[PDB]
Write a protein that binds this ligand. Structure first.
Ligand SMILES: [Zn+2]
Ligand SMILES: [Zn+2]
Ligand SMILES: [Zn+2]
Lengths: 134, 134, 134
């Protein structure tokens, strides 16, 4: 079949941040008509989720992430760097998500958006979109 | 190679519900002999996991989801709709899971079943099974 | 295209354990030059994450998993077997992760390693690496 590999960067504006990257991903899949887009970050302290980018919810993801794994929590990693919480929550959520491609477009539900969740910003994060199909 | 795309629906019976959808997924992969099945929901308030569908555990997934992200919790999203908890826990778990296909069948471990977890039911949920391989 | 399917085993040394399996996965993808590696376990009580294998963090993943879903917690599943916590946390994290392959090598970020997280050891765990691409 066919394999497309394209990367783009986004600048996170705070320690905790959430960015809707759907538009950038739709550009990155060009070349594939029907298949699968793997939205991947080669980072260990930020994650990718597919959900609703409503204003309040964009805050909720971060605030609940903080509730589940408090940045002020106890982390053996923090002996070296103070972002153990970012590593832990990011590992649980995952560093990738799949989005089907159909008719050359992202096949998303009514309320689905591709979102990058940052837990150790501000930073320039790189997103790799590796698509496969025909 | 080959790309199969098939959808099926399941009716959730409660706000919190868990449904073993393995049989429906085994039908949806027909056409692919060796490859990968991406079990995807284009929903933002329900998720997909691959685990054991034992009776008690089917309750545990829901009860622990509730413990981690209480529906009665504080959500800025709830200003618009009262399902912020469903959005949050679903984003963390993920809206898809991969299952390998071999010999035309789902390659599952002894205790593995494909399970749909509902956090904002009752609703008719749609599952997309996008398979790729030969 | 091409489909490679290779399995390897790792012995977990404790109830809770974390093992860097990156090297074994790099061997298992041989045959694929450009594509996607799906690192999968057909188990229901251990999970796969892609993150930093720093010494302290390797402990943090396990300790925070324990904090989120206490093994001593209430599980209806424990009427049959006392590993309900392992099932729950493993379902949330997921039983697979994707790693892109480029130039015949795992395309990993500076701090990324493929890690197996065990919550019901000691056991011999099997990892399936199903790769697709050219
Ligand atoms: Zn760190
Ligand atoms: Zn909502
Ligand atoms: Zn069990």
């Amino acid at each position: 079949m066919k394999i497309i590999s394209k990367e783009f960067t986004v600048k996170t504006r705070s320690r905790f941040d959430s960015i809707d990257i759907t538009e950038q991903v739709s550009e990155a899949i060009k070349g594939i008509n029907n298949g699968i887009a793997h939205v991947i970050v080669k980072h260990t302290t930020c994650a990718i989720i597919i959900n609703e980018a409503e204003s309040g919810l964009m805050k909720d993801f971060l605030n609940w992430a903080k509730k589940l794994v408090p940045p002020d929590g106890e982390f053996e990693h923090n002996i070296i760097d103070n972002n153990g919480h970012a590593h832990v929550i990011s590992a649980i959520i995952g560093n990738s998500r799949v989005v089907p491609i159909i008719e050359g477009k992202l096949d998303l539900g009514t309320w689905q958006r591709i979102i990058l969740l940052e837990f150790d910003g501000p930073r320039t994060r790189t997103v790799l979109v590796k698509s496969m199909g025909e």
